[PDB]
Amino acid sequence: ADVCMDPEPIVRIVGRNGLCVDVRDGRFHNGNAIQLWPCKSNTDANQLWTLKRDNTIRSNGKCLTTYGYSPGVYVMIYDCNTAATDATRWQIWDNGTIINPRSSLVLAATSGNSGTTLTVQTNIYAVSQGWLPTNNTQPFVTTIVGLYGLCLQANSGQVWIEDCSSEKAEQQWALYADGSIRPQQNRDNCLTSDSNIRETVVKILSCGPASSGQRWMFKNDGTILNLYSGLVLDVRASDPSLKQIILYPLHGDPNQIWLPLF
């Protein structure tokens, strides 16, 4: 009917621990640090990013730029049409990763702390590498309903399935912009698996590490993908009374299908 002409939307970039992609202290000189910072509620240019049509991400005329093409170098703010033309190129995948195309190295927040400088690290699809461009800052607070129409309920350090209650403590989850799934009681805790192995009962640990085992993606087929190891959320032997939520290869049975009910 036409060509899907695309816009350049001004946006903030929320990532690890809900902290925005921010230009440090507002100064825009070539080489200043792109840091992590609490998401401002105003029109300060040092947090507002135009997703330009040429796969470049600009805040106030200057480009989100990697210093180099090696794991470890930091991401700075630089004059677009002065620096290397592909040190400013980025893509934003549907799974959350924002990636430079020269080397697969991905925008990451190596620490979950404020004032932390952004870098580019080798892509392990981790919590410290998941990003989401939005102007909505707060995470997504919903309930997660799975097999047999029962709820996902984090108790203290255990995730299990228990029939849904309108306000029970606690089955209300916050889907963060870094791919983590956090019980709203303690926002410092993530849906975490200790591997990178198959069965691996999923637990609830602190998001401090921001590891590849705490980042997830709600896929189109109703599964919740680990984004690493290619494993989804599985109810072990389809038995809720076991209180065992596990990782397992995608098979598509009701023990792997989920729907977020807000």
């Epitope: 180099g68 794991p71 592909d86 080798t122």
Partner: antibody, heavy 122, light 107 residues
């Protein structure tokens, strides 16, 4: 800084594969890219591709997409390129080089290797 | 996707005379270009690493500059050791060489 060294000359049967090596030393091996440049008579120089050791990422010239295959062994601090289905057009001197630093105003070519001659002949 | 057509294909020059080689990119390389001297029987050698900045140990008679897509390269006080093939390399989009220029000298 120090050095890169490659393998000696090679003769292959037309239609086979040969794996040139590039032994790196004197710098932190994992954090720097390794480049590859062909030089056949009259053709001057042409950029083949690059491989980053330590994380196995690659970037290929499209003319060598399918001809080249870069590999890096983290144990012995080396980098290998392999040319498949060698015709007589693949008979050339193959160089390996490095950038000077992490880029991007650095990461121009420095620290070349002495080159390796591949001769494809029956 | 960044082609670089170099000029001229080759040239001869009298001893001591200035020479000029030019490279032109399909798009802007943003002053990211180097010049290389391929002495016969020797490996490549870098002379100018940023568009004008000279590599150490290169004589003051080697010069180069440019803006955007057009680039120059000039050896001024030519000498019998300057016989080589010279190439232009950009490192903005990726590494792309020119066709090279072969320098011959007279006696």
């Amino acid at each position: 800084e120090v050095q890169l060294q490659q393998s000696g000359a090679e003769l292959m049967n037309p239609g086979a594969s040969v794996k040139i090596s590039c032994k790196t030393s004197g710098y932190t091996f994992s954090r720097y890219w390794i480049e590859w440049i062909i030089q056949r008579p009259g053709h001057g120089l042409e950029w083949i591709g690059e491989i980053l050791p330590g994380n196995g990422n690659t970037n290929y010239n499209e003319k060598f997409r399918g001809k080249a295959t870069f590999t890096a062994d983290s144990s012995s601090n080396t980098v290998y390129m392999q040319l498949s289905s060698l015709t007589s057009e693949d008979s050339a001197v193959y160089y390996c080089a490095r950038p000077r630093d992490y880029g991007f105003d650095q990461a121009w070519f420095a620290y070349w290797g002495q080159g390796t001659l591949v001769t494809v002949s029956a | 996707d960044i082609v670089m057509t170099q000029s001229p294909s080759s040239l001869s020059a009298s001893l001591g005379g200035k020479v000029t080689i030019t490279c032109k990119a399909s798009q802007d390389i943003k002053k990211y270009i180097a010049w290389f001297q391929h002495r016969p029987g020797k490996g490549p050698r870098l002379l100018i690493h940023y568009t004008s900045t000279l590599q150490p140990g290169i004589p003051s008679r080697f010069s180069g500059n440019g803006s955007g897509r057009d680039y120059s390269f000039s050896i001024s006080n030519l000498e019998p050791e300057d016989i080589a093939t010279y190439y232009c390399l950009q490192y903005d989009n990726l590494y792309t060489f020119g066709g090279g220029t072969k320098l011959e000298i007279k006696r």
